[PDB]
Ligand binder design. Structure first.
Ligand SMILES: Cc1cc2nc3c(=O)[nH]c(=O)nc-3n(C[C@H](O)[C@H](O)[C@H](O)COP(=O)(O)O)c2cc1C
Ligand SMILES: CCC(=O)Nc1ccc(N(C)Cc2cccnc2)cc1C(=O)O
Ligand SMILES: CCCCCCCCCCC[N+](C)(C)[O-]
Ligand SMILES: O=C1C[C@@H](C(=O)O)NC(=O)N1
Length: 359
């Protein structure tokens, strides 16, 4: 009903940003039905120092300001990541800044880190901090994704601020150095810049009290050169980074895009990104010898999509764009299909399938 009627009818009435705002509101108010699908033990994953009751999370960008976390767990996500959050509030780019490519099952966005800022999000998370502590213990962890202000003159200091303010409230933190929509940000993926940045981030993280000490992951682009990926793997292993998120949106425009809006500036997400992301997961898993947990993201809209990223080396996956086309039912669909495929392919559970292609 969502895929065939409601979503198509909604998208025909609201521009994508308005639709997004409404979706966040509806979710935060808990207007959706509580998901029927009950997670089986097969879907449980233990990684990053936590239990995840299922491996399917909501990717950063949907709940940028931490407004809909509980509604998202109700939707059936096994973990929630909010953000990106910047130190000071900022408006992001002028509108329009989000575009649907329905013929491609893709989206292009250039939000530019519109963010309520650390202080607002801090108090928002504090208001439900003990509820989250129980959810986490129950296998439903919370990630917080950190960004940088447009006018900041010290990128490392922006991330350090984010570690200090939201680190205590997060099960894991994400150093997002892969947004295509903030000038100069992706250059922080370079070896020397990344090592300096992550050394500072990890020191700030290590200075937090033990029970408030998050895992730290780095989120990378799908558009890296082979040299870029080798350098990132090297730095991650040198510094003991806890994990990678692979990938952000692509600035590439793959041959074959049909959408009228295909040449809008911004990051491309959804199906055209899927296999580019999967191959990046595959490479980073190999470069890190399977020792570094990967959250695989990009174009996941089915159980097969999820399992392909898991077999390529992901311990967990996330989705966003699929939600915008298929709506809330896609979460249970992905989980149900993933369980069936795991059984069909001889895996006792998700854990057995992680990196299976490499063996
Ligand atoms: C509208 C939109 C906003 C996004 N905002 C962020 C963000 O703030 N921080 C971040 O790390 N990734 C952000 N992303 C990237 C997603 O987290 C994800 O990496 C990417 O969309 C690929 O997954 P998908 O194809 O399932 O959407 C955004 C994506 C979209 C579509
Ligand atoms: C790319 C910008 C973006 O986020 N877009 C959307 C996000 C959610 C939804 N829903 C209506 C799904 C939904 C419905 C109710 C609750 N949660 C999610 C639709 C869209 C859309 O663009 O049509
Ligand atoms: C309020 C301080 C400046 C940033 C405002 C951000 C508004 C965010 C609106 C909901 C999220 N969305 C991506 C749909 O705009
Ligand atoms: O990390 C990010 C940032 C986001 C934005 O434009 O705010 N757009 C994206 O596609 N990825």
């Amino acid at each position: 009903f969502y895929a065939e009627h409601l979503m198509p009818t909604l998208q025909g009435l609201l521009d994508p940003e308005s639709a997004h705002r409404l979706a966040v509101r509806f979710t935060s108010l808990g207007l959706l039905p509580r998901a029927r699908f009950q997670d089986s033990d097969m879907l449980e994953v233990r990684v990053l120092g936590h239990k995840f009751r299922n491996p399917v999370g909501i990717a950063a960008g949907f709940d940028k300001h931490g407004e809909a976390v509980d509604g998202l767990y109700k939707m059936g996500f096994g973990f929630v990541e909010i953000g990106s959050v910047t130190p000071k509030p900022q408006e992001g780019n002028p509108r329009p800044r989000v575009f649907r490519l329905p013929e491609d099952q893709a989206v292009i966005n250039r939000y530019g880190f519109n963010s309520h800022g650390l202080s607002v999000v801090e108090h928002r998370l504090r208001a439900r901090q003990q509820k989250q502590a129980k959810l986490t213990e129950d296998g439903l962890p919370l990630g917080v994704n950190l960004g940088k202000n447009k006018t900041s003159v010290d990128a490392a200091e922006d991330y350090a601020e984010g570690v200090r303010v939201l680190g205590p409230l997060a099960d894991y933190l994400v150093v997002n150095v892969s947004s295509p929509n903030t000038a100069g940000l992706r250059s922080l993926q370079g070896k020397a810049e990344l090592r300096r940045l992550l050394t500072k981030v990890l020191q700030e993280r290590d200075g937090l009290r033990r029970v408030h000490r998050p895992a730290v992951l780095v989120k990378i682009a799908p558009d890296l050169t082979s040299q870029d990926k080798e350098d990132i793997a090297s730095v991650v292993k040198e510094l003991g980074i806890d994990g990678l998120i692979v990938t952000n949106t692509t600035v590439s425009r793959p041959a074959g895009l049909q959408g009228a809006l295909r040449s809008e500036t911004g990051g491309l997400s959804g199906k055209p990104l899927r296999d580019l992301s999967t191959q990046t997961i595959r490479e980073m898993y190999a470069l890190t010898q399977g020792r570094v947990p990967i959250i695989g993201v990009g174009g996941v809209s089915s159980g097969q999509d999820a399992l392909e990223k898991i077999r390529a080396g992901a311990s967990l996956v996330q989705l966003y764009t699929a939600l915008t086309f298929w709506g809330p039912p896609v979460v249970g669909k992905v989980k149900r299909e993933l369980e069936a495929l795991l059984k069909e392919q001889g895996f006792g559970g998700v854990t057995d399938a992680i990196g299976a292609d490499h063996r």
